[PDB]
């Protein structure tokens, strides 16, 4: 139900509830008042703000609590709490009463404040967050309980993924006063003309109640009126297209009317562009694109997975300065803020649900992977939240699932359909593939539009041995190309752990020089694979992980450090990506 970015309009009062909240790890009676012994900030991951390991590794319930003043709410209005997200599960209390609930740590939801409380001076909001991951959650966790002889129970999650399980309220929480009868959803659809110069627009507006009139006023980047309709249909002559690294955004002001008066007004941006996949190519505006960019993480010192709009912008500025043009939201939906920024900057985005960890670890006879419900929900929420973004060019169903094992096809078949059935634009959906699932073994890739591969020849296979890595990477890309002559291929991950300061004359893995050598070898291969249409390094920047022997205080495959300072290899990518055009047809 929370699919619309919270805006301030003359009919919608939006209040930011961020700041300091009373805070507690562990159990709490929401009928009672949390002390100010512990506090926590909203938004931010809580983990790094803890000074001890035991606290940073806490798993279970933890609470945020604040007494909040009730604004003026008129008879025809209602009041909702709107969360960008709570990680991973959340129960929301008003005055000690359970009033809403959510599962999924990376998508927004709203919670209605009971009408009977609108004439009160104050309300106490209590948020019971929970950071347990399961075989029933996304991402997938290995959950276990050990009794302490205390004998309290210690909960722990052995992540089935390579990123630290940051938890907390990572995204802005809003107190939202809006009309009872309001605009629930807006879907924007366009059919571009033969020559790509005009657009037949369809604005599909959802309401809960009867409306007399629905006026839509479209404005261009100069805020000049260029179209108006009362029937949901608009024809725009001589449009400006949304082009890679050269964005053009229209904004659709939607006003609804009952009995000759404004009931609700919302402003939704859209961009005009066409996506197609054919002949081993990714077409944007009917021209062949070459992806260059990064797998990313929402990760930063101090804030962990919490939203930092300034990091979004610093990254995006660097991306574009490098000559890059895209990135993937690995391994979970990013914040709305980041999406709106990619739109504004013309950056291509591969948008993914948190389906990472779908891989067991004899044996497995019993049904342990109960992920289907969460998966279906994740897909619905992402498409409903993100479908209007011109920057979203493709969906990902999973990252590195066990796609070579029996039962894989039948799990993904309906989920891929779901993206198609839900996306008005029917964008391509992909599946990101692990090295184990080789062309012969894999049994899922027939279902998808674009082949995405994470490959580390010269790092995990043939470690530090480029001569043989080259033969391996080339061999496999040729098998993929052959098995699917039709589909485009995108390297969604490739890189090499690199610690700033480590140096060698002898191409030594972990040194800055080896990072350069690794990418040279990789690009020499890619450039000779006709159906390979894009390359996205892992990772943009170094990032936090859990304790595992092959992680040297986090992942270090970043071109930048966690503090966003460049490694040696950045100069090299800048020379390469400024030489390859965005609209680059190889083939030729």
Cβ neighbours, 10 Å, residue 227: 19
Distance separating alpha carbons of residues 472 and 184, to the nearest angstrom = 52
For Mg ion (CB under 5 A), the number of binding residues is: 1
Q: How far is the CB of 545 from a second copy (least distance, A)?
A: 10
Q: Does 499 bind a second copy (CB under 8 A)?
A: yes
Q: Is 268 a catalytic residue?
A: no
144 is a contact residue toward a second copy (CB under 8 A): no
Q: Which does 210 bind (CB under 5 to 8 A by kind): a second copy, Mg ion, none?
A: none
Contact partner at residue 72 from a second copy, Mg ion, none, CB < 5 to 8 Å by partner kind: none
Q: Which does residue 97 touch among a second copy, Mg ion, none (CB within 5 to 8 A, set by kind)?
A: none
Sign of CA dihedral 270, 313, 85, 143: positive
In this chain, which stretch among 12-20, 65-73, 198-206, 360-368 interacts with Mg ion, using CB under 5 A? Answer: 360-368
User: Residue 143: which residues within 8 A CB-CB, separation 6 or more?
Assistant: 132, 133, 134, 135, 155, 156, 157, 158
Q: Which segment (115-123, 359-367, 398-406, 578-586) binds Mg ion by CB under 5 A?
A: 359-367
In the residue annotation, 493 being an active-site residue is answered as yes
If one asks whether residue 35 binds Mg ion (CB under 5 A), the answer comes out as: no
Annotation-wise, does 557 bind a ligand? yes
| Per-residue H/E/C for 44-104 | EECHHHCCCHHHHCCCCEEEEEEEEECCCCCCCEEEEEEECCCECEEEEEECCEEEEEEEC
Q: How far apart are CA 18 and CA 41, in angstroms?
A: 7
Selected catalytic residue, list 65, 400, 476, 544: 400
Q: Is 19 in the site for Mg ion (CB under 5 A)?
A: no
Closest-approach residue to Mg ion (CB): 364
Give the CA count within 13 Å in the CB-facing half-sphere of 38: 17
502 binds a second copy (CB under 8 A): yes
The yes or no reply on residue 465 touching a second copy (CB under 8 A) is yes
- Could you tell me if 383 and 419 are in contact, meaning their C-beta atoms sit under 8 angstroms apart? yes
Neighbours of 267 (CB within 10 A): 15
63 is in an annotated binding site: no
Residue 538 assigned ligand-binding role: yes
Q: Does 507 bind a second copy (CB under 8 A)?
A: yes
Interface pick for a second copy out of 370, 504, 563, 585 (rule CB under 8 A): 504
The tokens describing 499, both together, are 């610690």
Selecting among 77, 336, 493, 544, the annotated active-site residue is 493
| Of 370, 351, 374, 376, the residue nearest 432 (C-alpha) | 351
Q: Which of 71, 364, 414, 528 binds Mg ion (CB under 5 A)?
A: 364
Tokens representing 385? 């939240």
What is the dihedral sign for C-alpha 23, 28, 30, 31? negative
**454 is annotated as contributing to ligand binding:** yes
Contact between 147 and a second copy by CB under 8 A: the answer reads no
Closest to a second copy by CB, 257 vs 510, is 510
Closest to 110 measured CA to CA, from 135, 92, 96: 92
Stretch 542-561 residues interacting with a second copy (CB under 8 A): 547-550, 552-553
Cα separation, 68 vs 175, whole angstroms: 10
Please report, for residues 45, 536, 543, the alpha-carbon distance to residue 300 in angstroms, rounded to integers and kept in the order given: 10, 20, 7
Interface residues toward a second copy, by CB under 8 A: 51-53, 56, 459-460, 463-465, 499, 501-502, 504-511, 547-550, 552-553
Binding positions for D-glucuronate: 162, 399, 454, 460, 493, 538, 557
Q: Site residues (CB under 5 A) for Mg ion?
A: 364
Tell me the catalytic residues: 400, 493
């Amino acid at each position: 139900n929370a699919m619309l970015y919270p805006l301030l309009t003359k009919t919608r009062n939006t209040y930011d509830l961020g700041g300091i909240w009373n805070f507690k790890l562990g159990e709490h009676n929401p009928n009672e008042l949390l002390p100010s012994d512990e506090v926590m900030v909203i938004p931010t991951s809580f983990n790094d703000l803890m000074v001890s390991k035991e606290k940073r590794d806490y798993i279970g319930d933890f609470w945020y609590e604040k007494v909040i003043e009730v604004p003026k709410v008129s008879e025809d209005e209602e009041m909702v709490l709107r969360f960008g997200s709570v990680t991973h599960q959340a129960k929301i209390y008003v005055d000690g009463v359970l009033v809403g609930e959510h599962k999924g740590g990376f998508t927004p939801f709203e919670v209605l404040v009971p009408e009977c409380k609108y004439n009160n001076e104050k309300i106490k909001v209590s948020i019971c967050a929970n950071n347990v991951l399961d075989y029933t959650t996304l991402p997938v966790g290995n959950y276990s309980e050990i009794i302490q002889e205390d004998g309290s129970i210690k909960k722990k999650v052995r992540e089935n993924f390579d990123f630290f399980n940051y938890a907390g309220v990572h995204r802005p929480l809003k107190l939202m006063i809006r009309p009872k009868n309001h605009i629930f959803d807006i879907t924007i659809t366009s059919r571009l003309s033969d020559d790509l110069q005009s657009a037949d627009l369809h604005f599909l507006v959802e309401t809960n109640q009867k409306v007399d009139e629905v006026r839509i006023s479209v404005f261009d980047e100069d805020n000049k009126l260029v179209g108006e309709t009362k029937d949901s249909r608009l024809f725009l002559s001589d449009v400006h297209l949304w082009e890679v690294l050269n964005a053009y955004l229209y904004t659709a002001r939607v006003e609804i009317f009952v009995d000759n008066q404004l009931q609700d007004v919302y402003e939704e941006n859209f961009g005009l562009r066409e996506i197609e996949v054919t002949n081993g190519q990714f077409l944007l505006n009917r021209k062949p694109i070459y992806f260059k960019g990064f797998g990313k993480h929402e990760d930063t010192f101090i804030n962990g997975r919490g939203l930092n709009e300034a990091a979004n912008l610093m990254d995006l500025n660097l991306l574009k300065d490098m000559g890059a043009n895209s990135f993937r939201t690995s391994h979970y939906p990013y914040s709305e803020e980041m999406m709106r920024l990619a739109d504004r900057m013309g950056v291509l985005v591969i948008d993914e649900v948190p389906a990472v960890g779908l891989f067991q670890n004899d044996n497995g006879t019993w049904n342990l992977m109960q992920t289907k419900a969460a998966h279906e929900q994740a897909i619905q929420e992402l498409v409903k939240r993100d479908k209007n973004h011109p920057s979203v060019v493709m969906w990902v169903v999973a990252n590195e699932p066990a796609s070579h094992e029996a039962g894989a096809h039948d799990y993904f078949e309906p989920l891929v359909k779901l993206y198609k059935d839900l996306d008005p634009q029917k964008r391509p959906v992909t599946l990101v593939n692990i090295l184990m699932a080789t062309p012969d073994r894999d049994q899922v890739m027939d279902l998808v539009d674009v082949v995405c591969l994470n490959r580390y020849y010269g790092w995990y296979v043939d470690h530090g041995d480029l001569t043989n890595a080259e033969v391996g990477i080339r061999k496999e890309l040729l098998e993929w190309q052959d098995k699917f002559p039709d589909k485009p291929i995108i390297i969604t991950e490739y890189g090499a752990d690199t610690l700033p300061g480590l140096h060698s004359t002898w191409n030594i893995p972990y040194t800055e020089e080896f990072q350069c050598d690794f990418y040279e070898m990789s690009h020499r291969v890619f450039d000779g694979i006709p159906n390979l249409v894009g390359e996205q390094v892992w990772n943009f920047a170094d990032f936090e992980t859990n304790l595992m022997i092959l992680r040297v205080q986090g992942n270090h495959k970043g071109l930048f450090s966690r503090n966003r300072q460049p490694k040696q290899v950045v100069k090299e990518f800048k020379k390469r990506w400024m030489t390859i055009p965005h609209y680059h047809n190889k083939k030729n």
